[PDB]
């Protein structure tokens, strides 16, 4: 019923914008519109030897960020999208036609799987 919500971003300040932001969305108490949060970027893991390991992750979507948001409310969506919009980790939209940008459910399931959810 829900939708996963996409914004753009500042390029290598999203994962600081992720801190900023979440924190916001848990200050003001908007946990129960946002779900999920999964972050455009590929895991890898790499081992070499026993005790030491290094796992890292390539970005896909830069300066994205798929938010599985509930702004289904009726005409607009709600305080949520004031929240990220007034967040230091902000500085605008793609420039379209409107200001966020919904993900379809079968693009959904292909950025969900890269990240780490489906897997």
């Known amino acids: ?55 890292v992750r390539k970005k896909l979507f830069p300066g994205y960020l798929f938010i599985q948001m509930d702004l289904g409310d009726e005409e607009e969506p709600n305080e949520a999208w004031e929240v990220v919009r007034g967040t230091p980790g902000i500085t605008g939209f793609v420039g379209a036609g409107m200001r966020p940008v919904p993900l379809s459910p079968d693009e959904v399931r292909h950025i969900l799987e890269v990240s780490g959810l489906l897997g």
């Open 1 to 55: 019923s829900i939708e996963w919500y996409a914004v753009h971003t500042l390029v290598g300040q999203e994962e600081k914008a992720k801190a900023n932001l979440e924190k916001r969305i848990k200050a003001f108490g908007l946990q129960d519109k946002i779900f999920q949060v999964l972050i455009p970027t590929e895991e890898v893991v790499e081992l070499r030897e026993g005790g030491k390991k290094e796992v």
